Amino acid sequence: QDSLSSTPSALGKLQNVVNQNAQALNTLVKQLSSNFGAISSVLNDILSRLDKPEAEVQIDRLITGRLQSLQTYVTQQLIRAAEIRASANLAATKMSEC
Amino acid sequence: FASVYAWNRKRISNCVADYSVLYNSASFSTFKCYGVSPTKLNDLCFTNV
Amino acid sequence: FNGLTGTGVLTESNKKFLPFQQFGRDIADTTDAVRDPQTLEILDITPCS
Ligand SMILES: *[C@@H]1O[C@H](CO)[C@@H](O)[C@H](O)[C@H]1NC(C)=O
């Protein structure tokens, strides 16, 4: 009890999971600020200025970039999920055997 | 009007801009817009023109 | 608002805007507060449910 209450790094393993997940979401949201070659990162600003054929060119650039950003996020989550599953399996084994 | 090598520039600010009077005119032979649609200009606001 | 378009619920803001500031921004580069161009009132912008 005294050790935990005086050791800031004692629960680093659990804090690391929280930090990594928060970081991933912050990255995903910040990608919405990228132009990806478009005149603007904001769809409403594109639609309010350009007509259909011109807007479509600009929108396609944003779709490509945002779709890639989302695919990156999901892939990383699947990999991290596998790591957590392995940890949970070990914890379950220790519960039974210890 | 100025010569093209010594072209004139005028700054326009702090005013209401009606662009339809120009676009719907029959007196202009060329009217081409870039980065913006000519039919949406009246819905927009700019810092300077 | 002065060419800034979007959809959401507008409410009175508790954000202490300075006299020169016209709008606030989120990390997604979206507007989450504006100054009304006629009343100079600060409004929060919340996305519709
Ligand atoms: C016009 O805008 C000014 C602020 O710039 C405001 O004080 C005034 O009351 C407004 N007039 C009307 C009719 O809204």
Task: Pick out its properties.
part of a larger assembly, 3 chains, 98 residues, mainly alpha, 71% helix, 0% strand, binds 2-acetamido-2-deoxy-beta-D-glucopyranose, Spike protein S1 (chain C), viral protein/immune system, delta, spike, antibody
Question: In a few lines, what is going on in this structure?
Answer:
The PDB classes it as viral protein/immune system. The entry lists the keywords delta, spike, antibody, Structural Genomics, Seattle Structural Genomics Center for Infectious Disease, ssgcid, VIRAL PROTEIN-IMMUNE SYSTEM complex. This is part of a larger assembly, with 3 copies of chain A. With 98 residues, chain A is mainly α.
Detailed description of the structure:
- This is part of a larger assembly, with three copies of chain A.
- With 98 residues, chain A is mainly alpha-helical.
- In chain A, 71% of the residues lie in helices and 0% in strands.
- Chain A is built from three helices and no strands.
- In chain A, helix 1 (12-30) packs antiparallel against helix 3 (52-97).
- Chain A starts with 11 loop residues before the first helix and ends with a helix.
- In chain A, 7% of the residues are buried.
- The A-C interface holds A 26, 29-30, 32-33, 41-42, 44, 48 and C 3, 5-6, 27-30.
